[PDB]
Amino acid sequence: AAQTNAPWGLARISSTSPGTSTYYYDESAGQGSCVYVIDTGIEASHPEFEGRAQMVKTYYYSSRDGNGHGTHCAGTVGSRTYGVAKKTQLFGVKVLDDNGSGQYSTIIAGMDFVASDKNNRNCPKGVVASLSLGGGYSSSVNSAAARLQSSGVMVAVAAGNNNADARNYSPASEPSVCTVGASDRYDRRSSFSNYGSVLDIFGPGTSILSTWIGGSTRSISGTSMATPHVAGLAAYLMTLGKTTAASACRYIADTANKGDLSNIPFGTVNLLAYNNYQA
Ligand SMILES: [Ca+2]
């Protein structure tokens, strides 16, 4: 399939070169997979989700996304226009309040929730979780992410927006999950993107157009935006049968565009998420 005039990040993930505008992908499009977006929620009513999104959990007085951040991330995973995996099922877990903040204890509860909740969902092709959040180093937060991964979920987490080594942030620093840095449309490391040995992969993160609350759309930037490209890619690849939850981060690294990003610090992977789709 070909989507013309796609957001640059979608075009990037199906291209051996920057500077193109058509997204190419297998029509299966993540059908039969599931992606949890652990964030401020998802506006499930947004026409862009086509009934494929739903809220499954909140820790606050509402499951509504009163921020937009979670809706944007979910859009990059699986919206019809702005998404990588256009037929995946999206599950919202609201661990962040409408200010975009969340106590680590609530975030941990949300991760353990997903590990159990997948057993209540139909995801024959596999399960992914996208965590566009983080804070300072916490062994408990890392351990929760590790459990989620261990349970059979492909966990993708944001590296962070500190232009610093991600070793000092969680869940970014957890070795067993897929830690995602951000790039821009000219294949530069995004200026805010964290880096370091703990990174596994980069994805498009600067000036990313996606869904927003009130049935709208918005361009924003962050490792929060790169993460759902990788989560959606994993779901897409799992539907194709090319990889599994336990192997998807490795597979994505194996098949990434290599050595093409600029301003990658010595010791950080130079790998850009790529679907290796040949139309
Ligand atoms: Ca990993």
CA distance linking residue 98 with residue 39, whole number of Å? 10
Say which of 39, 98, 165, 187 is annotated catalytic: 39
User: What are the beta bridge partners of residue 57?
Assistant: 93
Element (H, E) at 100: none
Q: Which residue intervals of 85-167 are DSSP H helices?
A: 104-117, 139-150
Q: What's the gap in Å between 130 CA and the centre of ligand 1?
A: 14
DSSP helix/strand/coil, 166: helix
CA distance linking residue 256 with residue 238, whole number of Å? 16
Q: Say whether 72 is catalytic.
A: no
Give me the sign of the Cα torsion angle 146, 110, 228, 172.
Answer: negative
DSSP type of residue 133: -
Say which of 69, 132, 173, 229 is annotated catalytic: 69
Closest of 206, 223, 230 to residue 13, by C-alpha: 230
Contact 193, 101 (CB under 8 A): no
Beta-carbon contacts of 141 under 8 Å, excluding residues fewer than 6 positions away, are 104, 107, 108, 135, 170, 171, 174
185 phi/psi in degrees, rounded to 5: -70, -10
CA distance linking residue 97 with residue 92, whole number of Å? 13
CA distance linking residue 88 with residue 182, whole number of Å? 23
DSSP type of residue 85: S
CA distance linking residue 182 with residue 171, whole number of Å? 16
57 phi/psi in degrees, rounded to 5: -165, 140
Q: What's the gap in Å between 28 CA and the centre of ligand 1?
A: 26
Binding-site entries: 16, 175, 177, 200, 260
Contact 30, 85 (CB under 8 A): yes
Q: Pull the structure tokens for residue 273.
A: 């998420």
The number of beta carbons lying within 10 Å of the beta carbon of residue 64 is: 19
Q: What's the gap in Å between 259 CA and the centre of ligand 1?
A: 19
Q: Can you tell me which residue has the tokens 């909740």? A: 117
CA distance linking residue 260 with residue 213, whole number of Å? 34
Closest of 145, 151, 240 to residue 200, by C-alpha: 145
Q: What's the gap in Å between 195 CA and the centre of ligand 1?
A: 14
Closest of 96, 18, 30, 1 to residue 238, by C-alpha: 30
CA distance linking residue 231 with residue 132, whole number of Å? 10
CA distance linking residue 25 with residue 4, whole number of Å? 12
Contact 37, 92 (CB under 8 A): yes
For the chain, how many residues are written?
279
CA distance linking residue 66 with residue 214, whole number of Å? 9
| 206, 203, 50, 44: CA torsion to nearest 10 | -70
CA distance linking residue 94 with residue 163, whole number of Å? 27
DSSP type of residue 174: -
Q: Can you tell me which residue has the tokens 């929620």? A: 41
Q: Can you tell me which residue has the tokens 């759902």? A: 228
Say which of 14, 130, 224, 229 is annotated catalytic: 224
Q: Which domain covers residue 209, as residue numbers?
A: 1-279
Q: Pull the structure tokens for residue 56.
A: 């499954």
Closest of 216, 213, 225, 218 to residue 43, by C-alpha: 213
**Cited resolution, angstroms:** 1.0
CATH code (residue 80): 3.40.50.200
DSSP type of residue 6: -
Please give the distance of CA 198 from its chain centroid, rounded to a whole number: 17
Contact 109, 102 (CB under 8 A): no
Contact 119, 151 (CB under 8 A): no
DSSP helix/strand/coil, 130: strand
Q: Which residue intervals of 118-222 are DSSP H helices?
A: 139-150
Q: Pull the structure tokens for residue 54.
A: 């739903």
Q: Which residue intervals of the chain are DSSP H helices?
A: 8-13, 69-78, 104-117, 139-150, 223-239, 248-255
Q: What's the gap in Å between 155 CA and the centre of ligand 1?
A: 9
DSSP type of residue 165: B
Q: Say whether 39 is catalytic.
A: yes
Contact 37, 238 (CB under 8 A): no
Q: How far is CA 52 from CA 80, 101, 173, in A?
A: 10, 26, 31
Domain count, the chain: 1
Q: Pull the structure tokens for residue 6.
A: 């796609």
Q: For the purposes of burial, counting CB atoms within 10 Å of the CB of 90, is it exposed (0-12), middle (13-18) or buried (19 or more)?
A: buried
Beta-carbon contacts of 139 under 8 Å, excluding residues fewer than 6 positions away, are 170
Binding-site entries for Ca(2+): 16, 175, 177, 200, 260
Q: What's the gap in Å between 249 CA and the centre of ligand 1?
A: 6
